[PDB]
Amino acid sequence: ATVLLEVPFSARGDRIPDAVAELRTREPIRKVRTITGAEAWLVSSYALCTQVLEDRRFSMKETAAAGAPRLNALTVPPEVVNNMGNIADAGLRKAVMKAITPKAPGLEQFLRDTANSLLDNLITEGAPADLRNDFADPLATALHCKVLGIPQEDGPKLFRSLSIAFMSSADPIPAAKINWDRDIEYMAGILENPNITTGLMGELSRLRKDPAYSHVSDELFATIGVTFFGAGVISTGSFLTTALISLIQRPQLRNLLHEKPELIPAGVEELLRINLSFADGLPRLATADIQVGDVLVRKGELVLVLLEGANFDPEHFPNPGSIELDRPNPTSHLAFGRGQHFCPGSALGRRHAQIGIEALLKKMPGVDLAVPIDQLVWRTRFQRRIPERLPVLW
Numbered sequence: 001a002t003v004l005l006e007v008p009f010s011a012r013g014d015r016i017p018d019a020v021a022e023l024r025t026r027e028p029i030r031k032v033r034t035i036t037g038a039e040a041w042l043v044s045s046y047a048l049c050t051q052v053l054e055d056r057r058f059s060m061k062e063t064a065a066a067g068a069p070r071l072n073a074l075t076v077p078p079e080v081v082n083n084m085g086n087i088a089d090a091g092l093r094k095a096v097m098k099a100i101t102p103k104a105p106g107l108e109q110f111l112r113d114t115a116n117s118l119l120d121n122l123i124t125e126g127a128p129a130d131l132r133n134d135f136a137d138p139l140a141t142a143l144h145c146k147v148l149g150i151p152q153e154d155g156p157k158l159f160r161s162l163s164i165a166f167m168s169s170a171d172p173i174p175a176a177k178i179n180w181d182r183d184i185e186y187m188a189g190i191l192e193n194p195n196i197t198t199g200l201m202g203e204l205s206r207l208r209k210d211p212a213y214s215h216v217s218d219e220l221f222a223t224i225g226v227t228f229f230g231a232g233v234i235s236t237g238s239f240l241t242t243a244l245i246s247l248i249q250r251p252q253l254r255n256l257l258h259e260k261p262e263l264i265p266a267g268v269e270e271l272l273r274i275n276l277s278f279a280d281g282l283p284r285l286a287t288a289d290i291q292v293g294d295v296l297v298r299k300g301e302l303v304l305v306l307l308e309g310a311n312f313d314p315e316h317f318p319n320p321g322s323i324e325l326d327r328p329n330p331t332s333h334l335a336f337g338r339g340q341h342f343c344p345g346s347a348l349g350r351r352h353a354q355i356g357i358e359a360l361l362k363k364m365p366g367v368d369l370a371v372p373i374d375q376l377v378w379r380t381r382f383q384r385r386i387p388e389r390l391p392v393l394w
């Protein structure tokens with residue numbers, strides 16, 4: 001006898017398990033067991049993944065309900081699950097969106113300067129360099145301090161919460177609450193700090209004292225700051241890191257993008273499509289009985305939308321494992337989700353990776369792994385797939 005198929009399949013972010021394609025072909029929605037012991041429906045075809053993400057009866061916010069089957073334990077207060085919904089309800093969506101676009105004056109120049117400085121320091125210190133801890137993550141952290149309008153020197157301490165905050169754990173995590181409460185107190189202080197007048201926290205600080213927002217809670221304002229810094233940093237840092245591995249693994253692509261930098265946006269779009277940075281499917285709770293493929297999903301059941309299921313589906317992306325810069329449907333991947341909860345940071349995330357890669361290829365055109373790829377150490381029971389260190393030479 002055998003037990004029910006368990007998720008996740010593998011913490012390795014450098015290759016997709018052969019199992020995904022077999023599953024997609026034979027059972028593109030099927031029952032699995034999560035690390036909590038709960039049952040869930042795993043959805044792995046492009047067609048069924050988009051169906052679920054485009055049907056609001058598959059609810060994000062209801063995943064936080066007491067007694068629901070769980071993918072993993074909450075690491076935040078249940079209100080945080082619906083942070084974007086609460087932002088919308090408070091009348092803050094347009095202002096938040098505007099604050100996190102990469103189009104702010106001087107932001108792209110800032111990103112370029114920061115990337116080049118990080119890379120110069122690596123070159124000075126001499127190979128091997130760790131491109132995650134000493135390039136991609138610090139670039140993400142610096143970017144988000146700038147976008148939030150908070151001091152650069154505060155970045156590292158906020159960053160160190162994240163190795164716990166974005167755990168994917170069977171059980172509640174005591175350190176997560178300690179760090180969450182501390183970070184909320186920090187952001188509350190930021191809102192009271194008269195020197196904070198730019199970026200997202202600058203704008204929130206202004207709106208907080210505007211009569212049109214006098215009944216928006218200080219808890220929500222602080223929560224937006226902690227949530228957007230943390231989710232933005234973990235998402236951009238982890239994506240850029242695993243995109244760099246994909247690029248290093250492809251010397252011909254690396255050379256083409258070095259030679260023709262104008263192709264980098266199209267390269268980044270394919271790197272997004274093939275990216276394995278999400279460690280778990282996106283969870284949703286059914287709020288009605290809903291037919292998905294051959295399965296009638298029942299009210300109250302957990303559904304997991306497997307992003308690499310959709311994104312490597314050959315029916316939608318022929319030769320899915322290949323980076324092709326001339327696809328006719330290049331942004332139709334699900335790396336930023338789809339529907340009601342489409343990532344509001346998508347433009348910023350694109351620009352972070354484009355500028356990071358452009359700088360790296362200019363400074364280190366000969367970049368290569370300094371260790372056999374199997375020697376990368378993949379973080380386990382985490383919401384992202386990332387190597388603990390990314391040693392390179394050039």
Ligand code: HEM
Pocket residue numbers: 060083084085100227228229231232233235236239282283334335336337338340341342343344345346348349350
């Ligand atoms: C390469 C970078 C990024 C990737 C791959 C990414 C990916 C995603 C995905 C897949 C979702 C949908 C989750 C779901 O439907 O369950 C999402 C939502 C979200 N993202 Fe991102 N993200 C990135 C960058 C950012 C940045 C830079 C920010 C903010 C500074 C951000 C903030 C958010 C927020 C607040 C949501 C929730 C939206 C909602 O519930 O309506 N993300 N992201």
Ligand SMILES: COc1ccc(-c2n[nH]c(N)c2-c2cccc(-c3cccc(N)c3)c2)cc1
Pocket residue numbers: 074075076080081082083084165166226227228229230231232235343345
């Ligand atoms: C800052 O630390 C956090 C840890 C977990 C969450 C969290 N727990 N459960 C849910 N639902 C969320 C959440 C809330 C808002 C946005 C995102 C999210 C999810 C995927 C990608 C990106 N960029 C953001 C996730 C939020 C913040």
